Amino acid sequence: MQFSTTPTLEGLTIVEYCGVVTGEAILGANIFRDFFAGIRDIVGGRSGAYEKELRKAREIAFEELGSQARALGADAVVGIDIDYETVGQNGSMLMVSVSGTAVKTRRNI
Amino acid sequence: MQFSTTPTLEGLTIVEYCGVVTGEAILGANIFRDFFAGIRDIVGGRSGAYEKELRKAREIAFEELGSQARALGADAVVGIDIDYETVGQNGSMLMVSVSGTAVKTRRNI
Amino acid sequence: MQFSTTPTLEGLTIVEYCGVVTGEAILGANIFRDFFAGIRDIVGGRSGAYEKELRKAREIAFEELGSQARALGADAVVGIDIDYETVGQNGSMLMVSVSGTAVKTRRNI
Amino acid sequence: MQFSTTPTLEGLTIVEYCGVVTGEAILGANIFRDFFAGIRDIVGGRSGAYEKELRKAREIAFEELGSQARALGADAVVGIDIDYETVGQNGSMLMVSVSGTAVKTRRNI
Amino acid sequence: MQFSTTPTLEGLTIVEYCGVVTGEAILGANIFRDFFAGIRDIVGGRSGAYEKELRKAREIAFEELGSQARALGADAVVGIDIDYETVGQNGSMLMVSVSGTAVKTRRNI
């Protein structure tokens, strides 16, 4: 079971299209205040307290994506897009949403 | 009726492009207040109350996009994109927007 | 004039790439107050008054997009993206932007 | 210099991929208050004066994008994305971001 | 290594897909106040002081994307997307996110 942002997989052929699947996670305001609010200058994943939160949010979004694909009998999700959207009163909640297309594949050889 | 984030469907060829179609749904601030605002820590679709609502907004949006396609004489919507946009003063309304290209397909066999 | 969110059109060949074209429309705060504010629960574009306004805005944006393409001598716009952006001091203005690539095509037959 | 939102150019072959390039421009609050804040109803870019400002913004973004590509030795930018983000305390600044992949091409004839 | 917003690389064949990779950087409120908040009129990356900041954030994100791909055995990241999201209480923080699909490639010659 592979995940790709590309619409096809070289070396394989998609033998069935099983629909659009989705995963998501929301980081609560508390996580934003604790790890994001204090950021000074430009801070990348490697150094920052926030990256472990984003990563957890991604990891959860992807598992939901994969499990939805699993339930359809798909073995890949292609054409994947990941979006981040700020939600809530204080612009302090974060939604990570993944979407792609569940597919059955066959090796070309 | 097939929906894909990919621009083509292997196994088929598109014989008509019938134009860009859309669907959307808006979750009002009452929904946001009730299911989204109290979120603590990181909450994925599995555990959280909000997920029922997102899902219902998505299905409704796809239904609208599906009806637009079907009305046009199309049998697939390809090159699909789903966007989420918060709107309104309090950032407490959520818009789910879907778009794609309605197409007529013919099987390669 | 054909519009597609796919980068190519099966059955035709792109003979000329004529550049990136765009179209937009902005729905003012008065539209938002009148049609979007205080939407309650989850409302789809099918039953919602707001959709008449969104449909109008997308219509106008595509006209502009179609009109830019025409002036370059194109007969299609491919690889189209549509996004919605909330703008302004009160998050009560919506901008719809379309973009894509103006192209000249030749039917394979 | 050719600009496209599609990944390939029909009629050409990409012989070298030279990396991701970007360009951008920010529209200040003053321009926003002058051209965007007063909009009533639905105004399209064809008649709306704000559109002169957006097109100036995009043009600057594409200038940067193409000059970046020029320096890498490229002759096209493919797989282009255009994005708008509202930024600042009053949702009254607008950033136009463009990205794509700089490439050398070879005409098939 | 090779970064592309295209899903394939003409002249090469993708021999393995190694999963979706991400990188990101956050620009803190202080950078925003010092470089973005004062902008007047329309200011492009070529001339704006904000540009070295965005450039720096992009570089950190791509580095993270880069090493993530390396750790998986990959020699290229294709299907790349860059998104900018304004986050926080005062719309004065900016997240730059990059995602793509890590791959192994083989020269066709």
The domains of chain A are located at: 2-109
Give chain B positions within 8 Å (CB) of A8. Answer: 6, 10
Class assignment of domain D2-109?
A: alpha beta
The three-point CA angle B51-B53-B59 to 5° equals 100
Distance from CA of A45 to the nearest CA of B (A): 18
Other C-beta atoms within 10 Å of D86: how many? Answer: 21
Sequence positions preceding breaks in chain E, C–N over 2.5 Å: none
Give chain C's largest Cα–Cα span: 54
In angstroms, rounded to a whole number, what is the distance separating the alpha carbons of residues D53 and D30? 12
Interchain contact, C64 vs D41, CB within 8 Å: no
D47's tokens? 């008649």
Residues in chain C closer than 8 A to D50 (CB atoms): 26
For residue C21, list its beta bridge partners.
C100
Neighbour count for residue D96 (Cβ, 10 Å): 25
Q: How far apart are CA A93 and CA B94, in angstroms?
A: 13
Tokens of E87: 């986050």
Chains meeting D at 3+ CB pairs closer than 8 A?
C, E
Contact, A32 vs A99, CB < 8 A? no
**Cα C94 to the chain's mean position, in Å?**
13
CA distance A40 to chain B (A): 22
Q: Cβ of A44 and E24 within 8 Å?
A: yes
What's the CA gap between A99 and A47, in Å, rounded? 28
Q: How far off is chain E from D101, nearest CA to CA, in Å? A: 6
What determination technique applies here?
A: X-ray
DSSP string for B55-106? HHHHHHHHHHHHHHHHHTT-SEEEEEEEEEEEESTTS-EEEEEEEEEEEEEE
Buried b / exposed e across C89-107, counting CB within 10 Å, b at 16+?
bbbbbbbbbbbbbbbbbee
Taking contacts as CB-CB distances below 8 angstroms, the residues of chain B near A31 are: 41-42
Distance between start and end Cα atoms, chain A: 18
Instruction: Select from A5, A37, A83 the Cβ nearest to the Cβ of E101.
Output: A5
Of B13, B67, B78, the CB nearest to C6: B78
Q: Which residues in chain A are contacts of B10 at CB distance < 8 A? A: 8, 13-15
Which two three-digit tokens encode residue E54? 């965005």
Q: Can you tell me the distance from the alpha carbon of D20 to that of E65, in angstroms, rounded to the nearest whole number?
A: 13
Alpha-carbon distance values, E59 to E26, E78, E82, E96 (Å): 12, 17, 12, 10
| Alpha carbon distance C56, C68 (integer Å) | 19
Rounded CA separation A30/A24 (Å): 18
Relative to beta strand E42-44, strand E12-27 is unpaired
Optimal mutation site among B101, B106, B107, interface C, most CBs of chain C within 10 A: B101
C1: how many CB neighbours lie within 10 A of its CB? 12
Phi-psi bin for C11: left (phi > 0), alpha (psi -120 to 50), beta? left
* Phi, psi dihedral angles at E30 (to 5 degrees): -65, -40
Task: Kindly determine whether residue A92 and residue E97, on different chains, have CB atoms separated by under 8 Å.
Answer: no
Sign for the CA dihedral angle at C15, C18, C19, C21 comes to negative
C-beta contacts of D62-65 below 8 A and 24+ residues apart: D62/C20, D62/D3, D62/D23, D62/D98, D63/D23, D63/E44, D63/E46, D64/D22, D64/D23, D64/D24, D64/D25, D64/D98, D64/E44, D64/E45, D64/E46, D65/D3, D65/D21, D65/D22, D65/D23, D65/D98, D65/D99, D65/D100
End-to-end CA distance of chain C: 18
Task: For residue E36, give the DSSP letter.
Answer: I
Rounded to whole angstroms, the Cα distance separating D106 from A48 reads 44
Q: After which residues is chain A broken (C to N over 2.5 A)?
A: none
CA distances from D43 to B19, C3, D28, D36, E41 (A): 23, 22, 20, 10, 21
Residues 6+ positions from E31 with CB-CB distance below 8 Å:
A41, A42, E53
**H or E stretch including A4?**
none
- Tokens standing for residue E107: 């020269």
| C93's tokens | 């203005």
CA distances from C23 to C58, C83, D99 (A): 9, 11, 18
